[model samples]
Target: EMCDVCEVWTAESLFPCRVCTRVFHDGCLRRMGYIQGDSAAEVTEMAHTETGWSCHYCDN
Candidate 1:
């Protein structure tokens, strides 16, 4: 997956948008109120446990 904001390929760290299904890096998601945990998988799990995720693309 690739982050549309940074345009970087996400090899390990990636966040999927719940609305549009776009993938973003953890860093990119962080800039938009996402919290990065110890690992990408952990963060994703945390996000799933929380309210969920919405990327910039889907937000706009």
Candidate 2:
């Protein structure tokens, strides 16, 4: 699947939103200001949290 934010399938780490069937790229998420000041390592670590990740249309 492609990123719900950018709507493009780039070669990078894509994360799934816990509330929807869509996924997102770390870069795009950062660009959108959904996540900030995070490195790949931190993002990866956060990805494994119980909260899952961000969701776009899943809410709005």
Candidate 3:
């Protein structure tokens, strides 16, 4: 599927950033940093940024 932030296809090593809550490709999130999601609740919380930005992964 296409990513909402970068507008690219989802692939291996691609991760969603909690800061932006956007499903970022490897190149995209790499510049930010590595983020980990240990549980469903964490994922839910991180999906949206403190500033309130919305994306595909965030809404899920």
Candidate 4:
């Protein structure tokens, strides 16, 4: 899958949006330094699991 953010498929480390179902590179987000779930509920859920993350598209 490719990230809607950077539109690149070369990145294997990616996350998915719960609503839009879009996948994005972790490298790109890591540059932002706030890749974890932004919302409070998501933050709680994502705290213990690296596999859990809710995209801003869904959170927004």
Candidate 5:
């Protein structure tokens, strides 16, 4: 899979953000210091109520 942030090819599995619907690899998430997909779920839940989400990096 390709990392959404780094745009690098990786062997990690792709995980869709519950909020943004953006595709990202497990390695990419860990690269940003995240340990689990739960963070993505949390961010998504916080940002969108129905079916939308803001990127985690958007805050930066």
Candidate 6:
């Protein structure tokens, strides 16, 4: 799927927001604060968090 923030096709490590179901690059989502940072561990933590999350678009 495409990144809702950058509107680009996700080619690399895709980060999907559990709330909105929109996909994004790990960097793109990190830039938008979807996760705390771009580290692989951090991205994985956010992606699998029990608390869930909101994307930049969904947060607004």
Better of 3 and 4 by lDDT: 4
So what's the TM-score on candidate 3? 0.25
Candidate 5, residue 8: Cα displacement in angstroms equals 6.7
How accurate locally is residue 39 in candidate 6, as Cα lDDT from 0 to 100? 34
Alpha carbon lDDT of residue 10, candidate 2? 40
For residues 1-60, could you state the per-residue lDDT of candidate 5 as single tens digits?
235676654333234433334556546667887665555434332223344333565342
Go through the candidates in order and give each one's C-alpha lDDT.
0.51, 0.54, 0.43, 0.50, 0.47, 0.54
Worst 10 residues of 1 by lDDT: 39-48
lDDT of 5: 0.47
lDDT per residue as tens, model 1, 1-60: 445676654334346643455566556668876655543224332224554444545454
Q: What RMSD does each model have against the real structure?
A: 7.6, 6.3, 9.1, 6.4, 7.5, 6.5
Query: Which ranges of candidate 1 are over 4 A from the true structure?
Result: 10-21, 34-60
Index of the highest-TM-score prediction: 2
Question: Which model is ahead, 2 or 4, in terms of lDDT?
Answer: 2
Error at 21, model 1, angstroms: 4.6
Q: For candidate 1, report its TM-score.
A: 0.33
Over 9-60, each residue of candidate 3 has an lDDT whose tens digit, in order, gives: 4333234444444465544444556444332332332333343334445553
TM-score of 5: 0.30
- Candidate 2 Cα errors over 4 Å, as ranges: 10-13, 16-20, 37-60
TM-score of each: 0.33, 0.40, 0.25, 0.34, 0.30, 0.38
* Candidate 4 residue 39 C-alpha distance from true site, Å: 7.6
For residues 3-55, write the lDDT of model 4, one tens digit per residue: 66677554333455423466655556667665655433433333124544555
